[PDB]
Amino acid sequence: EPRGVVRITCPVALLQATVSTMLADFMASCPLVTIHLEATNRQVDPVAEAIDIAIRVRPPPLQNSDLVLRVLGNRCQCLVASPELIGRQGEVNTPVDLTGWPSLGLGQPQQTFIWNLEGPEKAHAAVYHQPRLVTADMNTLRSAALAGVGVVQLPLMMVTEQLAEGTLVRLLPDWSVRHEIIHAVYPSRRGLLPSVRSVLDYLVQRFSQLDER
Amino acid sequence: EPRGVVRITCPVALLQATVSTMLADFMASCPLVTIHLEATNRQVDPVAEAIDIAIRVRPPPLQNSDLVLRVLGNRCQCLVASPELIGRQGEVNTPVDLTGWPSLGLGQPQQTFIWNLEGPEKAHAAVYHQPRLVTADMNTLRSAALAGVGVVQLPLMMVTEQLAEGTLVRLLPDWSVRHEIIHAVYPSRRGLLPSVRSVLDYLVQRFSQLDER
Ligand SMILES: O=C(O)c1cccc(O)c1
Ligand SMILES: O=C(O)c1cccc(O)c1
Numbered sequence: 140e141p142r143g144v145v146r147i148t149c150p151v152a153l154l155q156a157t158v159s160t161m162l163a164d165f166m167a168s169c170p171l172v173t174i175h176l177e178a179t180n181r182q183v184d185p186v187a188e189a190i191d192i193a194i195r196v197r198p199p200p201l202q203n204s205d206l207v208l209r210v211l212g213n214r215c216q217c218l219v220a221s222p223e224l225i226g227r228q229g230e231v232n233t234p235v236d237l238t239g240w241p242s243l244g245l246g247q248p249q250q251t252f253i254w255n256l257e258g259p260e261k262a263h264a265a266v267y268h269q270p271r272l273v274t275a276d277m278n279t280l281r282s283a284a285l286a287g288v289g290v291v292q293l294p295l296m297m298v299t300e301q302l303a304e305g306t307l308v309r310l311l312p313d314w315s316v317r318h319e320i321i322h323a324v325y326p327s328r329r330g331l332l333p334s335v336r337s338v339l340d341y342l343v344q345r346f347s348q349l350d351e352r
Numbered sequence: 353e354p355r356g357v358v359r360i361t362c363p364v365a366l367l368q369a370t371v372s373t374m375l376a377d378f379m380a381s382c383p384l385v386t387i388h389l390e391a392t393n394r395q396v397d398p399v400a401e402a403i404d405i406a407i408r409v410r411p412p413p414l415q416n417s418d419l420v421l422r423v424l425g426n427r428c429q430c431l432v433a434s435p436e437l438i439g440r441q442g443e444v445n446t447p448v449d450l451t452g453w454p455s456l457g458l459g460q461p462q463q464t465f466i467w468n469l470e471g472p473e474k475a476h477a478a479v480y481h482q483p484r485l486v487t488a489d490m491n492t493l494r495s496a497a498l499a500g501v502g503v504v505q506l507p508l509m510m511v512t513e514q515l516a517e518g519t520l521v522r523l524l525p526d527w528s529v530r531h532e533i534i535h536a537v538y539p540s541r542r543g544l545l546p547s548v549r550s551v552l553d554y555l556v557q558r559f560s561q562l563d564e565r
Contacts, residue, residue: 151391155489163498174485272379272389276372
């Protein structure tokens, strides 16, 4: 019954870990729907590039633009390093202790990398680091952290198996990094289209069925 | 001993499946080397953007540009679909039989998607398809193919576990799609730098230790 083309954008790590299997199951149940899916980590302007659904992962506050916003879930972040690296660099009891640790950075080389932390008694700390590895691929960062290259901040869901095995260890567990909000942004008119709506509703139902943090 | 910044580009699927663990191990053994790694599937111009090492995956023939070329390995491709999809769409004994099958496409939406095939007795076939799913992420394509959304062409190394389980099946096994060559392209002067060379040599040794096809 739903038929037409739907143009979607989604960050890479979220697509591989979560969104891909949703879209696969949707397309199996809606044979007449065509999906053009750009896997990119760039900020996408939905109105100009005529994007029907743009999935984003950003920390609050979020864009109060003219676009419609639907929240899909919250994902917490954490600072991790390997036991080997911890054995060499000392103890981390306050954010100041991270100064000088080798680090890894998610993004582009020209960016300024800073860990924003909130701790007990409403304490805030902002720790600048010069990472020796900079990339947008979360898989590569996790493998580098596993080898003890540097401390890195990753989404919890990306490292759950490693932390359970002990091959990665959480630093400063009493402090917390700002959480990220998985949300979908769409132009008001595009969501009216029947095919776009069916895709939108199915994602909402699938994300509601998840109990990830 | 090696120290400095090395700027590298690498396609996503190859980075996640292969190149990431190499760079991780290298950086653990060379603490003074900084790596800026862009994970992108775009054609990178190394000379203009001042890229030290650009890793590419393209079928032969390759660029005879002024850049230095080092071959790292050959990766064969194959056409796969799920048993369920095969049960619904009929039998595939010649490339003509693929006409009309729902398909998936690796790339951008505006591209023209054609399967180039070579068969027995030096027979060539070129099968145009209109894919209902278009993306650059290989993981998403594999999950869609697993759900029976469409026939897709993927690198063999990406589907070895699926084919062994039977959840994906190889179409037209007597025909072959052109193979892809993993190679690294670098400006002649940039490779002279000590840090770039150490990275280059380590990749050459690591890829030589692989016996992937
Ligand atoms: O929960 C996830 O799988 C996830 C994936 C990517 C980014 C992110 O913040 C969260
Ligand atoms: O052999 C691989 O892992 C590979 C990964 C990506 C592309 C490709 O042609 C091959």
